[PDB]
Design a protein around this motif. Sequence first.
Motif, mmCIF file in Angstrom:
data_model
loop_
_atom_site.group_PDB
_atom_site.id
_atom_site.type_symbol
_atom_site.label_atom_id
_atom_site.label_comp_id
_atom_site.label_asym_id
_atom_site.label_seq_id
_atom_site.Cartn_x
_atom_site.Cartn_y
_atom_site.Cartn_z
ATOM 1 N N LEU A 98 0.563 -1.374 0.265
ATOM 2 C CA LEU A 98 -0.002 0.181 0.131
ATOM 3 C C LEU A 98 0.534 1.066 -0.152
ATOM 4 O O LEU A 98 0.496 2.217 -0.452
ATOM 5 N N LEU A 99 1.827 1.229 0.770
ATOM 6 C CA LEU A 99 2.498 1.841 0.987
ATOM 7 C C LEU A 99 4.324 2.499 -0.347
ATOM 8 O O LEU A 99 4.273 1.596 -0.872
ATOM 9 N N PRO A 100 4.064 4.379 -0.262
ATOM 10 C CA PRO A 100 5.087 4.433 -1.218
ATOM 11 C C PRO A 100 6.486 3.281 -1.785
ATOM 12 O O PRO A 100 6.423 3.938 -0.543
ATOM 13 N N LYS A 101 7.133 2.913 -2.939
ATOM 14 C CA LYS A 101 8.316 2.475 -2.754
ATOM 15 C C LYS A 101 9.223 3.557 -2.517
ATOM 16 O O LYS A 101 10.398 3.183 -1.636
ATOM 17 N N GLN A 102 9.077 4.293 -2.772
ATOM 18 C CA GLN A 102 10.261 5.844 -2.375
ATOM 19 C C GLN A 102 10.299 6.167 -0.581
ATOM 20 O O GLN A 102 9.138 7.315 -0.720
ATOM 21 N N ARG A 103 11.010 5.915 -0.242
ATOM 22 C CA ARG A 103 11.098 6.004 1.323
ATOM 23 C C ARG A 103 11.934 5.875 1.617
ATOM 24 O O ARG A 103 13.141 4.784 1.838
ATOM 25 N N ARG A 104 12.267 5.930 3.340
ATOM 26 C CA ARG A 104 13.243 5.508 4.084
ATOM 27 C C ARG A 104 13.086 4.210 4.723
ATOM 28 O O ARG A 104 11.874 4.590 5.495
ATOM 29 N N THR A 105 13.967 3.716 5.495
ATOM 30 C CA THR A 105 13.479 2.057 5.469
ATOM 31 C C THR A 105 14.136 1.723 6.738
ATOM 32 O O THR A 105 15.988 1.917 6.633
ATOM 33 N N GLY A 106 13.760 1.674 7.769
ATOM 34 C CA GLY A 106 14.468 0.672 9.583
ATOM 35 C C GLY A 106 14.206 -0.355 10.012
ATOM 36 O O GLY A 106 13.008 -0.286 10.703
#
Length: 146
Positions: free
Chosen positions: A40-48
């Motif tokens: 559901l969430l956008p792919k261009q992001r920062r993941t931790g």
Amino acid sequence: LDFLQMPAVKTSACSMVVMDEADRLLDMSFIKDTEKILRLLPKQRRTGLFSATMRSAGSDIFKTGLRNPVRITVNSSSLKLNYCVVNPAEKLQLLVSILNNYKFKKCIVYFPTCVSVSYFYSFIQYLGKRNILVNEVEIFSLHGKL
RNA sequence: UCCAAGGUGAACAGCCUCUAGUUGAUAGAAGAUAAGGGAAGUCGGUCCGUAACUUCGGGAUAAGGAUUGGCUCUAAGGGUCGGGUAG
């Protein structure tokens, strides 16, 4: 997942996703839900991803959709690890023999299932009614189906 | 140049029949087998007995004659109502 599936919530402005205990959330059971949540969430992001056993989820970290990742490993007798080999029919009795003899402030006793938690909690309360174990012990039960 | 039934065959084929057409063609009377020899001839010789398997859907949840109850965490699992003794 239920919240994000509602049409009233828009996920387009999200720019930061954090998964704590990420080895548990990428487990075989949780992967079905987390795949949808990340879908559901956008792919261009920062993941931790943060987990005390992050090495075990070896190649499944890329299922989260890391873009520019940097793995971080932090390492340092604090506690004692014992084991007892006994006949199963005595096991609960042994538990009692630990509760009324050892020295502690808090003891956490783990059970396999929730019904076992409730059943043995009731039986140990019944034993304490008859004063089988005599100590200033207060016994609680907490399983995840409550 | 158009139309084109069925059954056996269980190998196009052949055989038999349904619907539909014929009884037309002067009339009457009176290839196969073979004993012994074997080219001596001539120019030239599918059905009876086994075993394993095996089709479609619907189902989720370890089974499906038995005493069914069956893991941890994680959205919802029909609605509502209800808690003591005393002043």
